[PDB]
Subunit: 299 residues, 4 copies
């Protein structure tokens, strides 16, 4: 039988409320990014050219999490970007290094030299982003990094096989999230399948792609995820790459729509995670894996 079974997305389920003693405020947002790296809030900016560059990795680490930079630039620009973040001259929170600064990241395309001048410039994590992680060309760029430079997050997968197979070769964290090619696995039943294995092993999960509203990210961590990757919903903000076009009745980031000051967006999303964790009586993300429960919504 080629038919595995019913695969669920965020729109497919709602979360069941539990006995609660914790208020929205009290809740602990701290959690692990890799093993040796950790995030104060469980949100990390996406490795998309239209979203995450400079002022972004700023707002990302000073508000609690990390920010990942893309592979679509000449070396010295990803090197002169990471080094522009770590360097600085009532923003409370603030995620820092061990030599106490800021936090950043980078994308690696399957190459090894870009991973070199990155790690040397002092990069906290580097991600092996690839439209299909479970391979030979990627399974290998692992060992070709482990035995030279660092905590590595390997690119996107959706299978239980693709996660045992990956962590063995030293996968220090996993990105899950795979019309045209006709391939995919709905996001919930992915994380449900990928952390069913990424545990026992101390290896966290990053839910990449599909994040529309606050009550989405709740379900992600609830299911296994240790963090969540935020792309399109930050796409056109002020602190991202684009210029500005004023053309009547509307304003764009040059082509994409302007989504204002980024802080607000990360505030309204954190606020959602807070209200979610309240309802569910999870005091902290580790508690949300123990005390979850969800029902299926036949729309």
């Amino acid at each position: 039988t080629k038919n595995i079974g019913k695969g669920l997305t965020f729109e497919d389920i709602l979360l069941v409320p539990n006995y609660s003693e914790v208020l929205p405020r009290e809740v602990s947002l701290e959690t692990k990014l890799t093993k040796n790296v950790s995030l104060k809030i469980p949100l990390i900016s996406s490795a998309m050219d239209t979203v995450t560059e400079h002022l972004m990795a700023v707002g990302m680490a000073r508000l609690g999490g990390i920010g990942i930079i893309h592979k679509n630039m000449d070396m010295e620009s990803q090197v002169n970007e990471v080094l522009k973040v770590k360097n600085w001259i009532a923003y409370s929170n603030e995620n820092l290094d061990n030599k106490g600064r800021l936090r950043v990241g980078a994308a690696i395309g399957v190459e090894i030299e870009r991973a070199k001048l990155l790690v040397e410039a002092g990069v906290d994590v580097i991600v092996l982003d690839s439209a299909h992680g479970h391979s030979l060309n990627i399974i290998r760029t692992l060992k070709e990094i482990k035995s030279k430079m660092i905590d590595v997050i390997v690119g996107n997968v959706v299978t239980e096989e693709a996660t045992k197979e990956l962590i063995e070769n030293g996968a220090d964290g996993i990105k899950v999230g795979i019309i045209v090619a006709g391939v995919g696995v709905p996001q919930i039943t992915a994380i449900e399948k990928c952390s069913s294995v990424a545990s026992k092993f101390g290896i966290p999960i990053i839910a990449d792609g599909g994040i529309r509203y606050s009550g989405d990210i709740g379900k992600a961590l609830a299911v296994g995820a240790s963090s969540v990757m935020i792309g399109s919903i930050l796409a056109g903000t002020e602190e991202s790459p684009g210029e500005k076009e004023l053309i009547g009745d509307t304003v764009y980031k040059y082509r994409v729509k302007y989504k204002g000051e980024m802080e607000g967006v990360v505030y309204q999303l954190v606020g959602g995670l807070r209200s979610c964790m309240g309802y569910l009586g999870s005091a902290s993300i580790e508690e949300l894996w123990k005390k979850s429960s969800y029902v299926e919504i036949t729309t």
Copy 2:
């Protein structure tokens, strides 16, 4: 496994007709609001500032149901709004207290000073509402009322069976059931089912709150264990609702919400739907409905 069951809404089900002797007009719609407070029809008007103040709660009571004055005001104000109802010194299907005056209820917020004055005011039932009802703060405001005061108490919003066990065990006389930014909820039919597992065993009546678009839903609620439904947005711009009238684009608005005319037309229609459902299901009472009700699973179409 995290996936428990599949959850169901009113829209997911259609009730199944059984053998029937009794006519839509000959059915009794008496139910219970709490162990000590009855109703003549199973409709309660929400504790929303767009729905119920005084003139609304009086409309409700005179028709069998009751109103629950919202808490979105001063303590002084709310004590006066319950009074105006207590002192209404025909209307044959009216709901009176053991003292011969119209019944009324009032909403209350987590953590008592408001409670006291309302129980002092003559309010009949106290509704302690919350986004999340199975919490420690809410249980704490429940036993810390039942010791200082003696009034009947309806509690919070709850969707799980664990939650309705504890609230009863702590002295709730009724419990209501109803829970995108959230990401949290169990659907109404599956919620009303689970909460009745526990409640219909202690004789404690359930109130079905929110999710009520039209007549069909009111029947479908009570059939799956609810003792009464609570109506809200359906009564939003009605003459007895709090706002003031005003004309904009050749249509009448309130305060903004689109005005719905006289309330009684709304509540007669709804009752007419319920009477009609218990006819198809051969039920001359609500406790009859609980015993002989059936439903099927609908996929859109």
Copy 3:
């Protein structure tokens, strides 16, 4: 558990092709309306005031099937519409004729109208149809008992949906049974209905009629295939010429006095019969009999 299963309607199903050796044109479309009465095409026009009166009851019985005069009128004038159809004296080829060789008519009654029945039978009516919104009632069983014990005749159920309902109804003497039922929140999807009602309809020679849920030619195929012997079309014969009303042009489309226009009903019946033929051909069935025997279907997830 109050969950008694899933409820499937027409658009949840698709009929599965079988080994075939009959073409559309080759097929038998003959069936039973009751034990005693029978139809040449399995189509009843409704008993709504907007579709079946004398003029509509004729084009149905000419083309093979039948029509049931709506009850929304006085006693004597319904008798007149009845005796108007039993009297068509001046190709037909498919005409449904009785024992005297006149056109076939059925008529509708309700509540406990015992006197309307007496008047209709003696006027020559072939069936009486006892409608209630809910037919599994003590008031419909009291009326069935009393019509069947007295005025001979063939009586139709009313409106049932469960199997206990059709069972209880045949016990008291129902010759034909009728299946079909937001303001109330009640109902059972039409496929799931005809199946369970048909699970009890056979075992006795009692045929089942499909009332409601009928939009397209292909919902007729789906209904008879699951058990029905007859389907009752009505919604879609409302604007036709032969239904009561008044051609009355407003704006740029012709209406009725209140529904939109549909032209000649012959054109619809011929469209529906011809689509049934195409279906029966895919299922490799030369009758409804054979259809029931070899039918099969799968569930569609719409998209």
Copy 4:
């Protein structure tokens, strides 16, 4: 018990990513059409009067494919459309063992026609029909084999039918069946048909219901050897109509689509990628290592 389970279509399932040894730009699209005709891409153009004449069968077989000339013209008219293909006077061509491009022709219950098209030297005769598992379709298929060729039989979905048709004569099996009220959702239909016919090297052809490049991926993955594309090629320059502009957009009646190489290259790149994710070097590879999951409309 009547109902025989939930049937699935392309939109209900997504494919599940496997262990991947292979690349996109490096897979053997190659496959089988009939027990003995091979194709360089698994796409065959349909026999609709509004899709496949000569200029199109050419476009197909030139790109690795093949095209079935329709039965909507007198015997003569059609036979000349075949002649124009078995007679061209870039690489990756699909040619028969004598160095001439490959053509199919359709027929449906019609010996006299069938012999002629064979005589004009056609590769495949296609016994197309509404309901394929009929009597008049067995007898037509039989009489044809006992008087000459290659034969495909016309749209079945039930597994029984894929058997009574192979059992006596069939070389390939085409799968695909509002007013109608009949059919089996496409994925379930291929699947049901493959399981009862993959045994013999008899290829199943996925006929119709196709939309985006993904669908081709899905359709083979489950068991089909080749997928036929119909309404996606309809209004391209190499099809039947004539070009004329009426208000903004150009038509043929149906909206214009442009060169057909572009409809195919894009469709070629979708199978490239699909197989890349499901890490199969070949099509026969894929029918051994293919998992899928269900989606709901939400």
